[PDB]
């Protein structure tokens, strides 16, 4: 739907505030955190997978974060 | 004086040989100009007007379906067809349905099915496109005259961007703009809803997943891709029905997170965007800059006031004779040794004896003293400035960095005097910004911080390449944290 | 509402002070303090707005000052034509406007 | 010259409806807000509300929320104040006043010199 | 049978009686009478004030906007206990009848 | 879940996780909505007012 | 909004077709591919990043795919 | 001169007109027509039924 | 800071951090007390009555 | 409670003595001393812990006395 394709980051922002600036600044983070809290098993599995796949701690964390973000 | 009280106040100092300074104006913000021997002026972009809007396409957001039809075929006889199937007002879909003896057909298997329903749209939103030459820019030109229609309003058009304002007593100020480079409306569209309007990118508007009409369509039967607004169901693979989706105006509102709201109720009123304009002050004068002193006394009618930019605004009244006369104003120390501040309102003048006059000054950090008049009866004030030179410098550098971030290459033209260093910086930041836009177009801010973290780590762990990478990473992080969306 | 004396009288050529008192939302918090002169049978005319400053075409005899929650009007050199109804008006915090009870100015013969 | 012209005196029975016309000339009407102030004979002034000619939005006093409606006419540069269900206490002199809106076409913060000019007034008597 | 309504979510809403009050800097937040009732949605933000706004000092001043919340169209979420379930099953043998 | 004329059989917990104004089913006034901020928005175009 | 938290894959699926089976399985594929074709520079930058952080080919491709998936989803 | 009240803190309070009602488990939360007014203080706790 | 008959000169910030019910100074209604839970206690002795 | 947040020792004191200067200068020392009197076993346990974690005598003393200072703050 249209909500999946917001008009964000297209290089048109100016000094005056946008439409959903304040509310939309952290709404994605809030929904991701709620999904993490309410689906702990997938988070644990993603942590395990990131631990196994990578070769250094940095990419362990990177893969964990990416897998967590994509899932919702 | 109109810029007094606005937190988005900016100062530009000095002029070139031709008495020309590049300045940039933004909606909701204004700038203050002064030079060595020139009057202090305030520049504010207040209104953007587009006269001729052209409808690009109409997006339907509520629809209703009637005249639902259904036709079925026995298995292995292809799919059924209806005369409304070509009639593209009727959205149609083919599915497969179990057929058998109980269904009135002599064979058993996957039978064809088709359903069509008339697509009627209740209300819709309009996307209006405007040619760049149809833009109107309104600028107010108010000098720091000290008076309690004070300024002059001028209009800027892309076809005629050469104009000047006749200031009463100051002579004439020449201000020539270049709106072709401010905002590219060739790639912009003015989306308009029932009573609210947004200014969104044209390309992002074209590919919206909604039924749409050509901008010139009036009858309302040329809808494209109606399937994005209706759905078909086969709960048990025995009969399909079509129902309409709900109103998308809330979904559309959620889809305009980074859009900028504009006004299209009483005309194409835009209160957004910037304007890089070329200012020429060859023919400016000072009102009565030849009068003598006001040897009389004074009294403050409204006491010291502190703005957000470290300046002071004072209204004072004269009761002596000799009006009109010059106001003795200067920022001295306690023992009267050295000049400490400068006058934002250059040459304070008493136009009329009983008329109060507003004066502006920029005291230094620490103890500051305002000298009014001359002995006897001279006034000395005791305002203290809270802050430090290092604090002012660092606040200035954040303001400059954020202005650079939000204006792109045009930020070098805020106070450019035509210097070669300014041109080199403008070109370098222009190519860097072109690369950045071609790189991070249409990406969320949190993703920008993630990318910045990635390149900062890479640069830290990998020396010229390392320093370049960490600089790029920290710049990206600053852009991400500073950007609203 | 705004509280002020109903009637104030003074000798001609003298200096008198009249005060208008409201609350913290309208008078004690804002500079939207203005005074209007109402001639008997004629439309009201402003004699003073933004008490620290004065309007155009109005004599400098009228002077206004605000002390906390009380706004005061001072007239120097009372004259015969000053006998008129004077009103104090303030733009309150809630976005509306409040007016005083009206004052009658009397000049002794 | 800014001239404010008001209609003549009117008499109406209680419970009727009266619409008064205040015509302003000599300036750009659309760029200024319009005010309506009433005053009982020998009493204090009362402020009803204002209309912004730039957008036509409305704002009335708390007391006059459910009975006072004011409209504006751009073509005639006039504002019409209509009061319904008149009462014997409504007998008063009604003045129309003007003040400047900001440069953005809105009337959020009134100017320092508000009520800059006043109209001659309309006298309405209720039986 | 007999579902119990649990929670109703709103879809259509309208806002009326919008009010804002003009708060100067350093004198605290503003206040309205309508925030006493929770039908009015209110939020505190920070706005510029000055002499042009008729305040004695220049700075960032408070402001609050309150407007009554009136919902027009809403959904209904109903929960039925498992004891109220009703299952209907058809039973047909191969009698061979048409 | 009940709409104007449609209905869906959906999970209860996800239903309570909907970020929309709501009242518990026991209410009869039907006017005390909760987290109404999720359906309204305050805008400050130039930090002059909202 | 609610559209960002659809009731997808929560274990309540049955034999009957759900509300948005057919094209609901794919609005992902369509919107991510449109985003890719509309902003190729970010895809290129993600490619260099995957080549950089990733040591083996599998993890390189994995990081690239995850970044490409985040880019529209995070918006 | 002219002190300005920055904030008024309440320091003495009394609780009267107390009201309460319960709801059976798994039908949401109990409701009054009353919480709409902010002058009252309300809290949701959890009880056996 | 003013008591019924006594007074003190205190820093503004610590005064703003006092956990007591408050109205803004400009308020005159005298009823909208914020964070009232700091002066009330809801007792639920044995999960039968609050 | 407000008594847990006293407006004390933050740089606003002048020549004038404060509101609880003389009799109020010594709540905490006497309170801690009384708590130690009436709760010895915790003090011996804290001394043992300071002996354990601490490496040098100064660290042991710091941990012991400053733990005993922490102890009645929460209670
Ligand atoms: C809101 O405004 C309408 C129309 O002006 C009015 O009928 C209503 O009473 C107002 N609301 C309140 C709470 O007074
Ligand atoms: C509280 O109870 C008293 C009992 O005398 C009653 O008079 C009063 O109206 C009640 N208050 C409310 C708000 O119901």
Author numbering:
A (entry chain D): 90 to 161
B (entry chain B): 1 to 148, 157 to 470, 473 to 495
C (entry chain L): 3 to 9, 11 to 27, 27A, 27B, 27C, 28 to 95, 95A, 96 to 106, ...
D (entry chain H): 1 to 52, 52A, 53 to 82, 82A, 82B, 82C, 83 to 100, 100A, ...
E (entry chain C): 51 to 148
F (entry chain C), I (entry chain A): 199 to 248
G (entry chain E), J (entry chain F): 90 to 164
H (entry chain A): 51 to 99
What text appears in the publication on this structure?
The human monoclonal antibody C10 exhibits extraordinary cross-reactivity, potently neutralizing Zika virus (ZIKV) and the four serotypes of dengue virus (DENV1–DENV4). Here we describe a comparative structure-function analysis of C10 bound to the envelope (E) protein dimers of the five viruses it neutralizes. The neutralizing antibodies induced during a DENV or ZIKV infection target the envelope (E) protein and, with a few exceptions, are serotype specific. The epitopes are distributed evenly at the surface of the icosahedral virion, which is composed of 90 E dimers organized in 30 “rafts” of three parallel E dimers (Kuhn et al., 2002).
To understand the binding of C10 in the context of the virus particle, we determined the cryo-EM structure of the DENV2 virion in complex with C10 scFv. We obtained a cryo-EM map to ∼3.3-Å overall resolution, with the M/E glycoprotein shell well resolved. We found interpretable density for the scFv bound to the 5f and 3f epitopes but not at the 2f site. Instead, the cryo-EM density for the 150 loop of E at the 2f site was clear, and we could build it readily. C10 binding has been shown in previous structural studies to induce disorder in the 150 loop (Rouvinski et al., 2015), as confirmed here in the X-ray structures reported. This was indeed the case for the L2 dimer, where we found no density for the 150 loop and could build the C10 scFv instead. Comparison of the level of the cryo-EM density of the CDRs bound to the 3f and 5f sites showed that it was about 50% that of the E protein, indicating that each binding site had only half occupancy despite a stoichiometric excess of C10 scFv over E protein when preparing the complex for cryo-EM (STAR Methods). Cryoelectron microscopy (cryo-EM) studies showed that a C10 single-chain variable fragment (scFv) could bind only one of the two epitopes on the L2 dimer on the DENV2 virion, either 3f or 5f, and did not bind the I2 dimers. As a result, we see C10 bound only with half occupancy to the L2 dimers, and the predicted asymmetric state stabilized by C10 binding is not detected because of the icosahedral averaging to determine the structure.
